[PDB]
Amino acid sequence: EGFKANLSLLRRPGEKTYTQRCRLFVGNLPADITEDEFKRLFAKYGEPGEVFINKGKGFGFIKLESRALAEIAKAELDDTPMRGRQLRVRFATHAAALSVRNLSPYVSNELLEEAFSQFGPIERAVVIVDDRGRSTGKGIVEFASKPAARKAFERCSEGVFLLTTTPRPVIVEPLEQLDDEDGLPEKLAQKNPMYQKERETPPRFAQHGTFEYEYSQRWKSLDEMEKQQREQVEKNMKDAKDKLESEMEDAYH
Amino acid sequence: LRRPGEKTYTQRCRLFVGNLPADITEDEFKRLFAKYGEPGEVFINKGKGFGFIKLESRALAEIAKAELDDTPMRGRQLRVRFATHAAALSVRNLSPYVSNELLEEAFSQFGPIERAVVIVDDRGRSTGKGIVEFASKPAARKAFERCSEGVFLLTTTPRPVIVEPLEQLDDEDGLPEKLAQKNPMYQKERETPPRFAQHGTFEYEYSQRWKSLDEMEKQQREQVEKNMKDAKDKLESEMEDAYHE
């Protein structure tokens, strides 16, 4: 296909096609929606991948070839009319992603992928970096399937998985996925009859002498104590970890 | 393409463009983006081979980034990214009844606001955390300084907002192998390949005990949070009593 080859230019070097990162959620679909009509909606974005539709609930999923194509489709189709309803197009939440931590600063995206590839087919692996491009010691591993993610999670929790020379065991947890795009809209927050009551008092600075001020100041102080205490735990445990290493070196000569 | 209630030409509409040829002109840079409507502020550093461009809406900037990134431009592949936001703040201790709109209306006190969002979980419930993006750095700084010094409240319930600079992290480019410094630490770290440590070895025994200490640390941190949640609760009733009249 001519069209397909033209759109294939949007795949990035080393990018795997039709991954979960290429998957779009489409909401507010008509009740009479067919799989062909849904695909016709995405016709301009090349050859479609797996399609899922929940006709009665008015939503579906579609995988496109590359992340770029899915970014274009989302931006072009979101909030467009479809028989009396504005479509809601979002990137689908990843179903098989894991958070990895305790990474050595010398673990790259490629080493992380190559390492986790033993648990099953891998879509992507990324080391989360800061503004200067330095490793945060945290990363994300996205698998093709949920069993492969469970295998990685179960084996890394049970066993000792090491990526570099330094014996730093990778700590593996399911990825906490949060929404900072739609968030908590007022039209939705309004539903609780209590939103009306809390909004009776407008945003403000509390004044010295009031209940609001004394309570809030003491709350901040408790919050500061909480951070100190958390930092102290961290320190105490850093010392315990060091004492462990020293004692381990002596015993294992 | 503009979304309902979306402000135009914000920092969320700003794109970074790297790997530009040395002989690039402001007009050629704009022509590169001509498809994406009327351009906003343009900045170019000709000698360093990069620029910034603001487009009308986030949708337009998303299309431009996706269409122009990794395309050839006289010997090099362009690198198109969303510009890091320079006036964004993390807000916490939010009441579960604070919406994106209330958060924006509240912070609009400190200066012009681009966007404010409450971060929700998979179940659409407030995490008690949010993001506020200002038009300018002085406004973000004002919001940051005032909310640290004073007690800023958004609802009837006296919950002070805690305001911090937004830690901005990269999970798109990450740490590529090609750009890792092959210094001595790298050299030492890369000698041993990825593996599972085996029972009886130093690596295993140490790593297992380290995991155990790490589990204890995590439990202890959770316990601090619980203890302080209890202190915060006793505080609420004490204050309600003290201020009864």
Short mmCIF file of C-alpha atoms in Angstrom, two decimals, chain A residues 9-13 68 71-72 74-76 78-79 101-102 104-111 115 118-119 124 126-131 133 135-136 140 155-169 171 177-189 192 194-195 197-206 209-220 222-223 225-227 229-231 233-234 236-238 240-241 244-245 248-249 252, chain B residues 1-4 59 62-63 65-67 69-70 92-93 95-102 105-106 109-110 115 117-122 124 126-127 131 146-162 168-177 181 183 185-186 188-197 200-211 213-214 216-218 220-222 224-225 227-229 231-232 235-236 238-240 243:
data_model
loop_
_atom_site.label_atom_id
_atom_site.label_comp_id
_atom_site.label_asym_id
_atom_site.label_seq_id
_atom_site.Cartn_x
_atom_site.Cartn_y
_atom_site.Cartn_z
CA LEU A 9 7.49 7.60 7.98
CA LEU A 10 5.95 8.67 11.36
CA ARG A 11 7.38 5.58 13.18
CA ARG A 12 10.45 6.63 15.19
CA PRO A 13 13.83 4.77 14.98
CA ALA A 68 2.96 9.93 16.16
CA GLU A 71 -1.04 11.65 18.62
CA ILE A 72 -2.36 13.12 15.41
CA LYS A 74 -6.23 12.04 19.13
CA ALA A 75 -5.63 15.78 18.45
CA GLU A 76 -7.72 15.76 15.21
CA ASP A 78 -11.04 14.61 19.99
CA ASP A 79 -14.06 16.84 20.60
CA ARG A 101 13.23 1.54 40.94
CA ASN A 102 16.63 1.23 42.65
CA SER A 104 21.93 2.35 39.06
CA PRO A 105 22.52 5.74 37.29
CA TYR A 106 24.27 3.74 34.54
CA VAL A 107 21.19 1.76 33.49
CA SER A 108 20.02 3.10 30.06
CA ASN A 109 16.62 2.61 28.31
CA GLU A 110 18.20 -0.18 26.15
CA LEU A 111 19.82 -2.12 29.09
CA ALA A 115 17.02 -7.09 30.84
CA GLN A 118 13.50 -12.24 29.42
CA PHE A 119 10.00 -12.09 31.02
CA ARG A 124 9.20 -0.10 25.57
CA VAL A 126 12.48 3.92 29.72
CA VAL A 127 14.66 5.26 32.49
CA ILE A 128 12.96 8.40 34.01
CA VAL A 129 15.44 11.29 33.89
CA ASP A 130 15.46 14.78 35.47
CA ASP A 131 15.77 18.24 33.68
CA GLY A 133 19.02 14.25 31.73
CA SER A 135 18.63 9.10 35.90
CA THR A 136 16.16 9.44 38.77
CA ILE A 140 9.04 2.22 33.31
CA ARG A 155 10.15 -13.06 39.78
CA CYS A 156 11.74 -9.66 40.66
CA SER A 157 9.87 -9.57 44.04
CA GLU A 158 10.65 -13.21 44.89
CA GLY A 159 14.20 -13.31 43.47
CA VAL A 160 17.12 -10.86 43.19
CA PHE A 161 17.27 -9.24 39.78
CA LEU A 162 20.44 -7.31 39.04
CA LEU A 163 21.21 -5.15 36.01
CA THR A 164 24.78 -4.04 36.67
CA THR A 165 27.88 -5.09 38.58
CA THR A 166 26.83 -3.35 41.77
CA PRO A 167 24.36 -5.64 43.60
CA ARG A 168 21.39 -3.24 43.44
CA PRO A 169 18.18 -5.34 43.33
CA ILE A 171 12.34 -3.12 42.95
CA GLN A 177 -1.33 5.63 36.40
CA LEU A 178 -2.75 9.09 37.14
CA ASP A 179 -4.71 11.65 35.13
CA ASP A 180 -3.36 15.24 34.81
CA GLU A 181 -5.21 16.00 31.49
CA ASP A 182 -8.94 15.92 32.44
CA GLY A 183 -8.42 15.97 36.22
CA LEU A 184 -11.46 16.83 38.35
CA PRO A 185 -13.80 19.15 36.38
CA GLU A 186 -16.33 21.41 38.21
CA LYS A 187 -19.27 20.05 36.07
CA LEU A 188 -18.48 16.67 37.72
CA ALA A 189 -17.43 18.02 41.20
CA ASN A 192 -21.85 16.38 45.46
CA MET A 194 -21.25 19.45 49.42
CA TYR A 195 -19.29 21.25 46.72
CA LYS A 197 -21.24 24.38 50.70
CA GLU A 198 -17.37 24.25 50.55
CA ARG A 199 -17.40 26.95 47.82
CA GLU A 200 -19.47 29.28 50.14
CA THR A 201 -16.08 30.60 51.35
CA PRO A 202 -13.78 31.91 48.62
CA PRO A 203 -10.03 31.34 48.30
CA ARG A 204 -8.16 33.50 50.82
CA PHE A 205 -5.27 33.97 53.16
CA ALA A 206 -6.08 33.20 56.78
CA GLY A 209 -6.02 35.08 65.53
CA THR A 210 -8.66 33.19 63.56
CA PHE A 211 -9.55 29.42 63.92
CA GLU A 212 -8.54 28.96 60.19
CA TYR A 213 -5.10 30.50 60.78
CA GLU A 214 -4.24 28.70 64.03
CA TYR A 215 -5.45 25.34 62.66
CA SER A 216 -3.69 25.80 59.25
CA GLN A 217 -0.40 26.95 60.83
CA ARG A 218 -0.32 24.00 63.18
CA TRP A 219 -1.31 21.69 60.25
CA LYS A 220 1.71 23.05 58.25
CA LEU A 222 2.65 18.80 61.55
CA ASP A 223 3.25 18.42 57.79
CA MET A 225 7.35 17.31 61.18
CA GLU A 226 6.11 14.53 58.91
CA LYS A 227 8.77 15.36 56.30
CA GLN A 229 10.36 12.21 60.28
CA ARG A 230 10.29 10.59 56.80
CA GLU A 231 13.77 11.99 56.05
CA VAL A 233 13.63 7.09 58.57
CA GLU A 234 15.51 7.34 55.29
CA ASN A 236 18.39 5.57 59.74
CA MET A 237 17.80 3.03 57.08
CA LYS A 238 20.63 4.26 54.88
CA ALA A 240 21.39 0.17 58.49
CA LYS A 241 21.95 -0.67 54.79
CA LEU A 244 24.70 -4.52 56.44
CA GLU A 245 27.06 -4.11 53.48
CA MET A 248 28.37 -8.76 54.50
CA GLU A 249 31.84 -7.95 53.11
CA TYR A 252 31.78 -13.28 52.56
CA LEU B 1 -8.79 22.43 17.63
CA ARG B 2 -9.04 24.69 20.62
CA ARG B 3 -10.58 22.88 23.48
CA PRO B 4 -13.49 24.36 25.53
CA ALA B 59 -3.94 20.24 19.61
CA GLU B 62 0.59 18.13 19.26
CA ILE B 63 0.09 17.74 15.50
CA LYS B 65 5.37 17.93 17.15
CA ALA B 66 4.19 14.54 15.78
CA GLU B 67 4.52 15.65 12.09
CA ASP B 69 9.77 15.51 14.86
CA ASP B 70 12.43 13.31 13.35
CA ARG B 92 -1.00 19.51 47.48
CA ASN B 93 -3.28 19.10 50.56
CA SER B 95 -9.72 18.99 49.64
CA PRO B 96 -11.43 16.26 47.48
CA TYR B 97 -13.98 18.94 46.53
CA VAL B 98 -11.44 21.22 44.78
CA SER B 99 -12.03 21.07 40.99
CA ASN B 100 -9.72 22.23 38.14
CA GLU B 101 -11.79 25.49 37.87
CA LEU B 102 -11.71 26.32 41.64
CA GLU B 105 -9.86 30.77 40.06
CA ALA B 106 -7.91 30.61 43.39
CA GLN B 109 -4.97 35.92 42.44
CA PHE B 110 -1.19 35.77 41.85
CA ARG B 115 -4.16 26.14 33.29
CA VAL B 117 -5.55 20.76 36.99
CA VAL B 118 -6.39 18.48 39.94
CA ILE B 119 -4.61 15.13 39.54
CA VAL B 120 -7.08 12.29 39.76
CA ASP B 121 -6.62 8.51 40.07
CA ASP B 122 -7.90 5.64 37.79
CA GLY B 124 -11.54 9.71 38.88
CA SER B 126 -8.82 13.61 43.57
CA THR B 127 -5.34 12.55 44.72
CA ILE B 131 -0.70 21.46 38.91
CA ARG B 146 2.87 33.83 49.39
CA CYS B 147 1.60 30.28 49.92
CA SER B 148 4.78 29.35 51.87
CA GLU B 149 4.74 32.54 54.05
CA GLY B 150 0.93 32.68 54.54
CA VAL B 151 -2.04 30.30 54.88
CA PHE B 152 -3.81 29.98 51.56
CA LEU B 153 -7.26 28.30 51.75
CA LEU B 154 -9.50 27.29 48.77
CA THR B 155 -12.63 26.02 50.55
CA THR B 156 -14.59 26.51 53.86
CA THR B 157 -12.48 23.78 55.54
CA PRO B 158 -9.15 25.29 56.66
CA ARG B 159 -6.84 23.04 54.58
CA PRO B 160 -3.69 25.06 53.75
CA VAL B 161 -2.46 24.43 50.15
CA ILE B 162 1.12 23.33 50.00
CA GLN B 168 9.52 18.04 35.66
CA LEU B 169 10.75 14.59 34.60
CA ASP B 170 11.37 12.98 31.23
CA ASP B 171 9.83 9.54 30.46
CA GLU B 172 9.86 10.09 26.60
CA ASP B 173 13.61 10.24 25.70
CA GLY B 174 14.87 8.89 29.05
CA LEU B 175 18.50 7.84 29.25
CA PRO B 176 19.59 6.53 25.81
CA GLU B 177 22.61 4.22 25.56
CA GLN B 181 28.99 8.80 29.44
CA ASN B 183 33.32 7.24 32.26
CA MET B 185 31.68 4.38 36.72
CA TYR B 186 29.94 3.26 33.62
CA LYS B 188 32.75 -0.69 36.24
CA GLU B 189 28.92 -0.88 36.31
CA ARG B 190 28.69 -2.43 32.81
CA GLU B 191 31.18 -5.28 33.34
CA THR B 192 28.52 -7.62 34.82
CA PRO B 193 25.42 -8.35 32.67
CA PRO B 194 21.76 -8.34 33.91
CA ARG B 195 21.01 -11.47 35.96
CA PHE B 196 19.23 -13.08 38.84
CA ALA B 197 21.54 -13.54 41.86
CA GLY B 200 24.61 -18.74 48.51
CA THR B 201 26.41 -15.92 46.68
CA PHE B 202 27.47 -12.58 48.29
CA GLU B 203 25.25 -10.72 45.68
CA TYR B 204 22.17 -12.78 46.64
CA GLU B 205 22.59 -12.73 50.41
CA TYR B 206 23.35 -9.01 50.48
CA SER B 207 20.53 -8.09 47.99
CA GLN B 208 17.92 -10.13 49.87
CA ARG B 209 18.79 -8.50 53.19
CA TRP B 210 18.88 -5.08 51.42
CA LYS B 211 15.33 -5.78 50.06
CA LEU B 213 15.66 -3.33 54.94
CA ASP B 214 14.03 -1.52 51.97
CA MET B 216 11.12 -2.06 56.52
CA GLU B 217 11.98 1.50 55.33
CA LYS B 218 8.77 1.62 53.16
CA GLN B 220 8.31 2.86 58.46
CA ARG B 221 7.55 5.71 56.00
CA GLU B 222 3.89 4.55 55.79
CA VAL B 224 5.07 8.09 59.83
CA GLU B 225 2.25 9.10 57.46
CA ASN B 227 0.98 8.71 62.88
CA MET B 228 0.88 12.17 61.43
CA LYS B 229 -2.58 11.60 59.94
CA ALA B 231 -1.93 14.00 64.86
CA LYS B 232 -3.61 16.06 62.10
CA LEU B 235 -5.53 18.83 65.76
CA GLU B 236 -8.85 19.33 63.95
CA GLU B 238 -8.68 20.50 69.45
CA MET B 239 -9.10 23.56 67.20
CA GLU B 240 -12.80 23.09 66.86
CA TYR B 243 -12.45 28.06 68.84
#
